[PDB]
Amino acid sequence: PAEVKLSPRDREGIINPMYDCQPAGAQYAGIGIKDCIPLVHGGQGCTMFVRLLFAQHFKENFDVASTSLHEESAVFGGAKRVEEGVLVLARRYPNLRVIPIITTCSTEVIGDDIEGSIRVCNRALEAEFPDRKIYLAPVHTPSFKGSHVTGYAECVKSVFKTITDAHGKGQPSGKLNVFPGWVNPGDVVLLKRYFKEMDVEANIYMDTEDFDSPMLPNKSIETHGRTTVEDIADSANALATLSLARYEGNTTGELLQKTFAVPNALVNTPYGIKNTDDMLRKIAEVTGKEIPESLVRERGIALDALADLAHMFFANKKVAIFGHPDLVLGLAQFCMEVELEPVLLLIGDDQGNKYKKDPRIEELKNTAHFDIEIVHNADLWELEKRINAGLQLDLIMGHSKGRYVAIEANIPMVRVGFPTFDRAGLYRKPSIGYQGAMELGEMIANAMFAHMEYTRNKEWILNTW
């Protein structure tokens, strides 16, 4: 019988890392907050390289500051660099409200007391700016543990703890909290539409829609996170939390349940049809609202489109998928709905104890008719080496830092997850939901079609399908 096997990378070192380090993910969490400038306590590269990474994915600038740790502070302590950095930010950015103070390998190794610096800064800020409130959140993100996925989740949780500690529980809002995880602006646009069509009030944490900002006649800069202090504080007042990503915000939903008795509902990340269906069923359950006819229609249009592709072009084609764990596991399920065979799943960090318990692994074990290898703690050399050793793949799905693997092996690749810098506009295209499943399926087919043309592999067949 077919076997779904979990295995670790068998090397100590990394070649071609799948993810960045924790502080990068904490920066990504923070840039989704309005009137927020994260402050990365460590050497300058820890900031500047991540600002470049976000420019690669989004083709936009995001504001993140460094504490500029130098030799003196590496030897004698960096608290004064934190403290000066906070004050320089507040003095030069009058509308600044939130500063996640993100540690790095350096400042974790030397043991700077971030909570003590925050007390110093709160004192200093209260004296200098008696009419402002600036929220300083301690974010402990040593890069020698976890990855950007864990750092994202840690920063969301710390910021929510900080803001809700200050505000507490108050008037019930009647809204859902929604933690979609690390998704694109197009994913956020699709979720907002779903809630609007279902007549469900919701805050999406973080609201990154406006990362795709206009070039306007008045030259105004609108490239900002839309989640406010007020939105975050109101999370204590929600009817329920819908957590879409076990590794990308569910721990914040759990904290709000523990602290404020907001019930948390973790569902499978909504990649593919069944996972979207079950997300909408959970929203209906928690809210008492009906699923609208408009979503039945969108679902039906997606199924119509995928039916043009599945047995003709996808059946029995083997796929490798890499990316964030919620995305890898969700896309594996989507692939099987359209008769693709996801034979190799690669997840890129040290969280294997958690992944072994993910219920979607069992869901795959109970459905797959082909062997699946799930490599955890994987790097992208694990994919390249397996292709070199003879693994036959028809498709790769992953982010752009794997591009050379696909190019050299002459395998079509669909760009998913983060970062997708080597194609245009993908941050605007949904991947989740019904429309997203349709868009993903058509991206797969179109990549295969172009490959058939370039390789002259039955290219004449693209006429009467």
Partner: protein, 473 residues
């Protein structure tokens, strides 16, 4: 005079870093502070010392494992970010290596973790026999002895050669310190450890060129035409072993005097090899450079044949662009040297007015050069930050900004076009052809219908939508 910008009222120390050149001043009284500590919290453009070693210099090499001893982020962050092709399939851009430091290694030491990672890298790619190992913030802090580990690996693997760099990010103030440590370690440890066959009467090293979009390969067409053997390129399209041979050259030709002046200085001191500084950007600059190289070697006529052919091929296109770019205002917000390589070359060859310049990490030497060559009414900024860029834009109103892509994407919102002053748009930009490439991208950036369309508010009944007529050389 020196300038206190409004956005710097609460960091008034920045006045000593910003010079507005005015008539009759003795510029010796107005040299920006440079290469000093960064101010925390400013959104300085600076990077780290590790970047200057691995990303900028060592990582250019085509045949060398780049083993970053540290947690995974420093590796991730230096991969898929540079444009330095090779003639072996771009090995340097396809791969990055990390020791994947974990907490146990912080507590108990990372030397065995490095040693294992090095053996794995050499085992995974048996035809690669050269490696540079770099420290990063935490492996420096815990005192791992990477030289001792490298020596043990070399003993156990007689096929390999390893170089080590102690370059944590917090060293120095910027990328600059990584340049220094790498240069000095390379000449102390690896120069004069190999020789190559000398195949010309005329030999040189080309020092301080990193093959951005093929710059080095373009310049090599000149050296091949002139019959000059390049012993080593430091480090564009280079090999580890070529760099071991640098002591053999008769001449060191320097372009990037900031990153690579150190090794030219030490090669002159130790081996007597003269240092010749040139500008390998700029059309008339390139001619001067070739004439100096040819005068040194006594091959003046060969140089004049090359120059005459290159002018006949490229000068008419360059002049077409000059006609349309004359009087345009440019800003240059890059590392440092391109400010002094470009301010007077774009003025001389394209008629372009450089109105504002910022250097991430330049030294006072770089400011001496740029202010010598630059215009009155121009701003000269050491270690510029984001809010300063906005205020400078209001002051000088540039038509185009040469800067990195993220800042380009920021100033786009203000309807100001950019050219990538680091990795180029459509390069190479060095040499005669390259300056035409640079002019073409500048032209297409500013003479761009989208800028005009973006300005129109379709709600304004008084406004129409224009059509713009462009050209091509």
């Amino acid at each position: 005079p020196m300038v206190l910008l409004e956005c710097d009222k609460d960091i008034p120390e920045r006045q000593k870093h910003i010079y507005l050149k005015a008539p009759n001043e003795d510029t010796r009284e107005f040299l920006p502070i440079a290469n000093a500590a960064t101010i925390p919290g400013t959104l300085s453009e600076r990077g780290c010392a590790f970047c200057g070693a691995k990303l900028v210099i060592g990582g250019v090499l085509k045949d060398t494992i780049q083993m970053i001893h540290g947690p995974l982020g420093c590796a991730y962050d230096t991969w898929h970010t540079k444009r330095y092709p090779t003639d072996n399939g771009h090995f340097n851009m396809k791969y990055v290596w990390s020791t994947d430091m974990k907490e146990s290694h912080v507590v108990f030491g990372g030397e065995k973790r490095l040693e294992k990672s090095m053996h794995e890298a050499f085992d995974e790619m048996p035809d690669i026999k050269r490696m540079i190992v770099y420290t990063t913030c935490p492996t420096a802090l815990i005192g791992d002895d990477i030289k001792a580990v490298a020596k043990k690996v070399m003993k156990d693997r007689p096929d390999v050669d390893v170089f080590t760099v102690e370059c944590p990010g917090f060293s120095g103030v910027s990328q600059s310190k990584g340049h220094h440590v790498l240069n000095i370690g390379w000449i102390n440890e690896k120069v004069e450890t190999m020789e190559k066959e000398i195949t010309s009467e005329y030999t040189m090293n080309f020092i301080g060129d990193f093959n951005i979009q093929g710059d080095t390969q373009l310049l090599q067409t000149y050296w091949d035409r002139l019959g000059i053997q390049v012993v080593a390129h430091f480090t564009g399209n280079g090999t580890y072993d070529d760099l071991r041979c640098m002591h053999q050259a008769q001449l060191n030709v320097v372009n990037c005097a900031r990153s690579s002046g150190y090794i030219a200085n030490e090669l002159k001191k130790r081996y007597g090899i003269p240092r010749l500084d040139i500008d390998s950007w700029g059309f008339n600059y390139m001619a001067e450079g070739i004439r100096k190289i040819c005068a040194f070697f006594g091959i003046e006529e060969k140089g004049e044949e090359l120059i005459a052919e290159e002018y006949a091929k490229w000068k008419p296109k360059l002049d077409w662009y000059k006609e349309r770019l004359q009087g345009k205002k440019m800003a240059i917000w890059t590392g440092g040297p391109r400010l002094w390589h470009w301010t007077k070359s774009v003025e001389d060859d394209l008629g372009v007015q450089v109105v504002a310049m910022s250097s991430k990490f330049g030294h006072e030497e770089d400011f001496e050069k740029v202010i010598a060559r630059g215009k009155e009414g121009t701003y000269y900024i050491d270690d510029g930050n984001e809010l300063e860029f906005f205020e400078i834009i209001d002051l000088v109103k540039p038509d185009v900004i040469f800067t990195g892509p993220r800042v380009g994407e920021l100033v786009k919102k203000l309807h100001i076009p950019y050219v990538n002053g680091h990795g180029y748009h459509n390069g190479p930009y060095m040499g005669f052809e390259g300056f035409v490439n640079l002019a073409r991208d500048m032209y297409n950036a500013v003479h761009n219908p989208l800028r005009h369309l973006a300005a129109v508010d379709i709600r304004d009944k008084s406004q129409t939508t224009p059509v713009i007529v462009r050209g091509a050389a």
